[model samples]
Target: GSSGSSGDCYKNFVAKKCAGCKNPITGFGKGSSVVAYEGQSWHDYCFHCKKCSVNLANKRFVFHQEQVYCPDCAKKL
Candidate 1:
């Protein structure tokens, strides 16, 4: 069942760099998807809250020291 590509699979190709790894999030090159937060985009594999290392994609988070953090971690500051 995995032999065929899912043409409709969503991809977020863009000009913005990944906030997590500071790398290009071009889906065409790495075949990787992207996640967005605040005003930046990140490769799905690189999306995580730096404090607790929790998945940040589509989750509540905050940015500080150029890093991501979960709400609780952000409040702990």
Candidate 2:
């Protein structure tokens, strides 16, 4: 997730998780940031799309569905 002043410090996190796989989706939900299909910390902020990559300055970003997105991305979600 992300924050406003801190950009995305565990604030902009807005998504739900799967029941079985326990994955995060677009909505209000809770769970760890363990997203990568293989390893831990493998899918944290180490990913992103073109739009999100361009807006990651003082802006927070999150990983989901293998993409780095911000609130804007959530809107479309």
Candidate 3:
């Protein structure tokens, strides 16, 4: 869903939809980055732990019972 980059552009634009909030990733300018996981896409801000609601972008996490979990929360399982 990513488009070609432009030398004058500040961010790489995409046309993918977010699976977390079911919203389109309308990256017309500066905004949250996009992520691809588990056959779906998500906004960087929307990707979080299902238990503690902690941000999981660019961090280690796990999936349990089809839900995202942080390291601390996953340990409690």
Question: Which is the leading candidate under lDDT?
Answer: 3
Q: Can you give the lDDT of residue 29 in candidate 2? A: 72
Give TM-scores for every candidate, taking all chains together and pairing residue i with residue i. 0.61, 0.28, 0.64
Q: What value does the lDDT take at residue 75 in candidate 3?
A: 95
Residue lDDT tens for model 1, 5-71? 5677655665787665677655456455567766777776687877678877666778788877889
Residue-level lDDT tens digits of model 2 in 3-45: 3455545555645444334455443376534333333322233
What is the Å distance of residue 7 in model 2 from its true position?
45
TM-score of candidate 3 versus the correct structure, residues matched by position: 0.64
Q: Point out where model 1 deviates above 4 Å.
A: 1-14, 28-32
The residue pairs in collision within model 1 are none
Q: Scored by CA lDDT, what does every candidate get?
A: 0.72, 0.46, 0.78
Cα error, residue 44 of model 3, in Å, equals 1.1
- In model 2, the runs with Cα more than 4 Å from the true position are 1-48
